[PDB]
Amino acid sequence: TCPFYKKIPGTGFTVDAFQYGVVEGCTAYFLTHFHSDHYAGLSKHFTFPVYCSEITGNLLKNKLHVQEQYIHPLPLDTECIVNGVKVVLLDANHCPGAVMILFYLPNGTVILHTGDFRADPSMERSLLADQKVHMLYLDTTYCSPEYTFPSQQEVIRFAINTAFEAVTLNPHALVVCGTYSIGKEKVFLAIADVLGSKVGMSQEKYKTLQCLNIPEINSLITTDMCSSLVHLLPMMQINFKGLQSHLKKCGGKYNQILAFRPTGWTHSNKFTRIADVIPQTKGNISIYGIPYSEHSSYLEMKRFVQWLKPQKIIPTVNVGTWKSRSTMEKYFREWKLEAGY
Ligand code: NI
Structure with a gap:
């Protein structure tokens, strides 16, 4: 079934959740980028709205033959309204068309979903700088110091x-x-x-x-x-x-x-x-x-998180083993104690 870390609380939204059939209570499906582990499940017979970047939208149409009426491309760095919720797409420094998604919940909570990303100090001067982020759904691919x-x-x-x-x-x-x-x-x-x-x-x-x-x-x-x-x-x-x-x-x-x-x-x-x-x-x-x-390398990832100071971190990668999960949660705690948030 759809895992909890692909669901955005307080919304009808999912991120990169196209292989679980019809997800109960999902009104809009976001796609962060055109990589197969993320788009797995999309085809020409998909009939729910898909929200994504312009480049991701070119690929859905031309490569997977998704019909155009269901593709909803959004410009980057722009406040947009989707089913009554303010969202912004930010460049993820991953592959072409890859985005991070900021969600501004009706109750005042702010959530960042990184998608897949390579953290860069340039992100510290996008629309991220302008408000506080409570929850971070983090690409933890290389979350260990050997990387x-x-x-x-x-x-x-x-x-x-x-x-x-x-x-x-x-x-x-x-x-x-x-x-x-x-x-x-x-x-x-x-x-x-x-x-x-x-x-x-x-x-x-x-x-x-x-x-x-x-x-x-x-x-x-x-x-x-x-x-x-x-x-x-x-x-x-x-x-x-x-x-x-x-x-x-x-x-x-x-x-x-x-x-x-x-x-x-x-x-x-x-x-x-x-x-x-x-x-x-x-x-x-x-x-x-x-x-x-x-x-992100481990150091790039650490610097990004210690800059952002989120209240809660939800990993999206390496979540399948208890040993991986416990290793990541140890690093999150170190980072928080070292920086003082
Ligand atoms: Ni990827």
Whole structure:
């Protein structure tokens, strides 16, 4: 049944709750972003109102064929009224179109649902700064101190320098980047830009990227693989067998692959700096796993919460085990005692 942490008390609202059938007493279904664990259950036969960002609304219509009459896109950073309740959508610094949702309950309670997010000090100057938040439904994906990772900027610097060096040394090297969902587009876009190429991909992936309002996108991507030296493939194909196969398909245009897997975290991070990352190699194929995260590190998460000072925290991630739950609740208490709220 729908779990309590997807329900907004004092409202007819749910968040990211599309796989439980008709939820008793839900008048509006919010969707924070277009990732499959969150939209699981939506299709063209859905007949309740869906509230979301403009970009999420492009994807629902074009990829899942939800009918337009049931899609309710809202602008960001704007006070809006939904079934008599004031809401605001804020940028979540996750994937394109991902939002956090502020709800202003009729009784005076203020609730923030982060969706999936990567906490950033820039959020400390949105409409969040202007009032107190009583309850926080928090993306706790990496809520443990072992989860450190570099900034997105440091990681892109590494990938750009790596790719530019490899291809300048060997003009017949191909760069491949893996993907399985929207998000992390900077990886492949920044590499293509330094090499002066477009990124080549399947028709299905080109379609998906055309929904994202990325400026100058027609200048950056293409379905013509033959004209491109950066190719996108399914994440599943980023291994030695899958890459040998793809190299065969390129018809002797290339004699070397350098491939990137943007992982979230990998325990090489406890010991190793980004400077120090090395690939796995077999023959003329090298694979780098790079720690490009679209979720908060433990420190980023801590700073956000100690700034916000919520009265109650409700985790939305890692809630399935008692050990996880008890570990998170210990960190919440430390943070509160250290900051004094
Ligand atoms: Ni997500």
